[PDB]
Design a binder for this molecule. Structure first.
Ligand code: MG
Ligand code: MG
Ligand code: MG
Ligand code: MG
Ligand code: MG
Ligand code: MG
Ligand code: MG
Ligand code: MG
Ligand code: MG
Ligand code: MG
Ligand code: MG
Ligand code: MG
Ligand code: MG
Ligand code: MG
Ligand code: MG
Ligand code: MG
Ligand code: MG
Ligand code: MG
Ligand code: MG
Ligand code: MG
Ligand code: MG
Ligand code: MG
Ligand code: MG
Ligand code: MG
Ligand code: MG
Ligand code: MG
Ligand code: MG
Lengths: 119, 88, 101, 73
RNA sequence: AAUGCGCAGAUACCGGGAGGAACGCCGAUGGCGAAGGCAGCCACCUGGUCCACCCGUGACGCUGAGGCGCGAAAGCGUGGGGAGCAAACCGGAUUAGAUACCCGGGUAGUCCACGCCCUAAACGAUGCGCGCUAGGUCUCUGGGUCUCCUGGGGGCCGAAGCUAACGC
């Protein structure tokens, strides 16, 4: 019952899950959701279908704080990334602008072995 | 560094005739100018090995011009060293 | 002596009194460090590409100098020692390599 | 194939060493802060080497970005 | 998948702080170095090199047993540091078994100073120097009369020729 109307959607994409946080224009979360929140368990949380629900769930949850307009900020490499956007669009919520903000070091920390092979 | 003018006074102080820029002395004098800077450099920056190689080559190029000069005119030889301060 | 370009980014927030206070120390520190000052342009303030010390703006300064090489790093230190002095960038001068002109 | 608008062309009489000429420098970065390749700047082997050093300096002054944010997806 | 972390409220998101390590794009088909090897930016201090002029010296040259110095990584000593990563190790899985591959942790170490160690697929698996023997072409970097000439460097294709062949 905060009332916000205008807000932000952070899609956190990953080869392993998808997590959608909705926030106010300052960045503080109104509500969130993910593959695990829609009752999926293992590999299926990375599945883009999951990502569709995960976004839709997170939407509706926020559409009851009277949201209408969202700035989208995609932030991950994974599957179910664009589908999380697709879901966000088709939820009536006006998507005012999508931005990729995947964080990337200017070569900094020694990565996990799994993620380097040939460096 | 060694500026143009710094370097001049060395060539004048050591040239056989005016405008001479490559007699044995002028060269040995010049290298000594060079060696002395560099040896003062590695006194401080002793981990700078790459430079240190330059140094063996200066010394090398030098303690060879002298070997020749001492073969040709020991007059000029005993002269150059007394004038500088080599052999120590 | 060599010809450097001393870049100083100032706190954009200071009213008149506080500003020319810093300038006085800037130019003083130059006099003390043997910085004969050739040309000089105070380009005012400009919008920064990213924030520097929480400010989205920065007050700019540029000094073309001629000063003793052996005294440059210690001169750059002294310039940075202050608060409202955000960046100091002392570059040595170059011939302007034109291109496509 | 592999050629659109070249950047050395859109401009004219500039100094590649001028690390304050933001209005000119910034034409050489992508939408992200990333310094454009030669195949898009249109600089020669050398010009590019000098511009990259120039852009880098201009980033430290806070005139040019280091990295920005893609705006479509 | 499970160990694991999470109601002592994690994950996701915003703001502030600490620290350690590495330097995205540019950037490679590129450059520098005797080799090892060298990549954010600035300054200082230094080494090698290349061109033009055709000014100086006048064979002062080449190689080089031994000697001396340098020498990835790992490893060692003393002190410091310790983000991420990670031999050993501790667990979870997998398997017939699993002292492994996969997963969650994790010490030495990886970092810095100083002192050792002296190895390598330390590779172009090709000692250094000088002379001679078609050309084409791409590229880095100088110079001149700059459609082209003329240096130095890095590739490719190829004359003669060489080679057990591959290839050069
Ligand atoms: Mg538990
Ligand atoms: Mg409770
Ligand atoms: Mg976290
Ligand atoms: Mg934070
Ligand atoms: Mg700590
Ligand atoms: Mg080489
Ligand atoms: Mg190598
Ligand atoms: Mg030099
Ligand atoms: Mg002559
Ligand atoms: Mg003669
Ligand atoms: Mg030899
Ligand atoms: Mg070693
Ligand atoms: Mg080591
Ligand atoms: Mg140790
Ligand atoms: Mg220790
Ligand atoms: Mg300790
Ligand atoms: Mg492990
Ligand atoms: Mg770990
Ligand atoms: Mg050591
Ligand atoms: Mg040996
Ligand atoms: Mg030969
Ligand atoms: Mg030209
Ligand atoms: Mg060639
Ligand atoms: Mg090479
Ligand atoms: Mg043949
Ligand atoms: Mg043979
Ligand atoms: Mg044959």
């Amino acid at each position: 019952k905060r009332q916000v109307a205008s807000g932000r959607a952070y899609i956190h994409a990953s080869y392993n899950n998808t997590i959608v946080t909705i926030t106010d224009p300052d960045g503080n979360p109104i509500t969130w959701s993910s593959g695990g929140v829609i009752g999926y368990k293992g590999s299926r949380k990375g599945t883009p279908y999951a990502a569709q629900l995960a976004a839709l769930d997170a939407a509706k949850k926020a559409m009851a704080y009277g949201m209408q307009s969202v700035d989208v900020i995609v932030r991950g490499t994974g599957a179910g990334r664009e589908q999380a956007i697709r879901a966000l669009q088709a939820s009536g919520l006006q998507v005012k602008s999508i931005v990729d903000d995947t964080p990337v070091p200017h070569n900094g920390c020694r990565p996990k072995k799994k993620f380097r092979k040939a460096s | 560094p060694i500026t143009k003018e710094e370097k001049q006074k060395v060539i004048q102080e050591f040239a056989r005739f005016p405008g001479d820029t490559g007699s044995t002395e002028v060269q040995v004098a010049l290298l000594t100018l060079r060696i002395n800077r560099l040896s003062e450099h590695l006194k401080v920056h002793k981990k700078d090995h790459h430079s240190h190689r330059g140094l063996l080559m200066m010394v090398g190029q030098r303690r060879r011009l002298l070997r020749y000069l001492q073969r040709e005119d020991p007059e000029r030889y005993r002269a150059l060293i007394e004038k500088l301060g080599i052999r120590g | 002596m060599r010809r450097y370009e001393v870049n100083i980014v100032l706190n954009p927030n200071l009213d008149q009194s506080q500003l020319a206070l810093e300038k006085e120390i800037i130019q003083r520190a130059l006099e003390n460090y043997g910085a004969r000052v050739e040309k000089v342009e105070e380009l005012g303030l400009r919008r920064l590409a990213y924030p520097i010390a929480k400010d989205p703006q920065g007050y700019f300064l540029w000094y073309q100098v001629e000063m003793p090489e052996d005294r440059v790093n210690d001169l750059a230190r002294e310039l940075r020692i202050r608060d409202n002095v955000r960046r100091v960038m002392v570059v040595k001068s170059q011939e302007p390599f034109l291109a496509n002109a | 194939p592999s050629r659109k608008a070249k950047v050395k062309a859109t401009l004219g009489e500039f100094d590649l060493r001028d690390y304050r000429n933001v209005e000119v420098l910034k034409r050489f970065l992508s939408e992200t802060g990333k310094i454009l390749p030669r195949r898009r700047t249109g600089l020669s082997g050398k010009e590019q080497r000098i511009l990259a050093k120039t852009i880098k300096r201009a980033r430290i002054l806070g005139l040019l970005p280091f990295t920005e944010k893609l705006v479509r997806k």
